[PDB]
Amino acid sequence: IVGGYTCAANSIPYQVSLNSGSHFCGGSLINSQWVVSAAHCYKSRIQVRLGEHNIDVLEGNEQFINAAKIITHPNFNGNTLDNDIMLIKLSSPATLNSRVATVSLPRSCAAAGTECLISGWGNTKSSGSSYPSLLQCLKAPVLSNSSCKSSYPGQITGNMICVGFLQGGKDSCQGDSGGPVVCNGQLQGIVSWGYGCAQKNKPGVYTKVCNYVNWIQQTIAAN
Ligand SMILES: [Ca+2]
Predict the structure, then answer these.
(1) Do residues 67 and 133 both lie within one domain?
(2) Co-location of 112 and 197 in the same domain
């Protein structure tokens, strides 16, 4: 996250780190057995780390649980990044408590201008890199259709929303992919793609979760 602030510890209890040797993408706990992430994060062995704040130190609230099933959306498209969404079933249920908690799926799609919170352990620098130990946070608004489509002509599909700031300097980046955009208590975006991070006139693009609630429920019920 570029231009963010350090989250208060355990204040985002639905945030997960996906790990294989090290952190590579985020995700969100949506019930005690299932995490949602980005399909472009797919790897075949994934450990899910819950209750994290500092990824570099064992702090004592963590639960580490390996993925048992990984299911990417059947129409995910690798150029266009349309349908960039993946579900992971844990091999046993997360224990829910104050440090580990689910986020609600959306009741409807969000209005333009709605403020949301974005979180993750991705890169913090435009210029150069610097992957943080501590979870970072960023408040940003859902941008209108117009502002999103004018930034990325011909590339924004009906399953994508833009969230952020046209001036640059605030955005999500590599390492945040897969992680949550929560607005008024509901998960409305997954970190997906962008041109660079925090570039003027190129806000982040996010998978539009309110289109996927049926697919998520049906997949959970069958698996
Ligand atoms: Ca830790």
Answers:
(1) no
(2) yes
CA distance readout (Å), 10 to 50, 62, 134, 221:
10, 10, 11, 30
Element (H, E) at 213: helix 213-221
Structure tokens at 59: 């702090």
**Cα–Cα distance list, 77 to 7, 40, 82, 98, 143 (Å):** 33, 9, 5, 37, 23
Distance 159 CA to ligand 1 centre (A): 34
Q: Give the determination technique.
A: X-ray
- 40 as an active site residue: the answer is yes
53 included as an active-site residue = no
Catalytic entry in 40, 73, 172, 192: 40
- Say whether 84 is catalytic: yes
Those residues with Cβ within 8 angstroms of residue 195's Cβ, 6 or more apart along the chain or in another chain: 152, 202
Resolution value, angstrom units: 1.8
Question: Torsion over CA of 185, 191, 193 and 196, rounded to 10 degrees?
Answer: 100
